Ligand binder design. Structure first.
Ligand SMILES: COc1cc2c(cc1NS(=O)(=O)c1ccc(Br)cc1C)n(C)c(=O)n2C
Ligand code: NI
Length: 118
């Protein structure tokens, strides 16, 4: 059943998806369209995959969730050249999503997980 952590992470994940209006990070990179993607990228990640893990209650804490978000960003910045729509979108999401994640971390530290999740 339902931990304050899952309640918090549901909110945080939707706030992160709210920073991706193009849906660039919403679903896995297609290996059919980009057949060399995994040559380069060991741990693919995207928001749908994070949601599945979240709903399976597979995150121990906020840090583990943040690490998956960081994979999304870091994979994109590794795979794509700097002068691309993908790289620019990853930088913007790193910036805007970072604000969201830092706020969540500080709220948990300030008022506790139970209160922060509510
Ligand atoms: C969600 O679709 C993709 C996301 C990414 C991605 C590739 C795709 N999928 S895709 O089939 O190549 C694609 C490319 C351009 C458009 Br417009 C739409 C899709 C689905 N790459 C190389 C990334 O770094 N990202 C984040
Ligand atoms: Ni490793």
């Amino acid at each position: 059943r339902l931990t304050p952590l899952t309640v918090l992470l549901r909110s945080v994940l939707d706030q992160l998806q709210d920073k991706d209006p193009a849906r660039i990070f919403a679903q896995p990179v297609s290996l059919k369209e980009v057949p060399d993607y995994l040559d380069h990228i060991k741990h693919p990640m995207d928001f749908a995959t994070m949601r599945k893990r979240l709903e399976a209650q597979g995150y121990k804490n906020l840090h583990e969730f943040e690490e998956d978000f960081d994979l999304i960003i870091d994979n994109c910045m590794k795979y794509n050249a700097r002068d691309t729509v993908f790289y620019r979108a990853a930088v913007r999401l790193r910036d805007q999503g970072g604000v969201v994640l830092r706020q969540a971390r500080r709220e948990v530290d300030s008022i506790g997980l139970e209160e922060a999740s509510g």
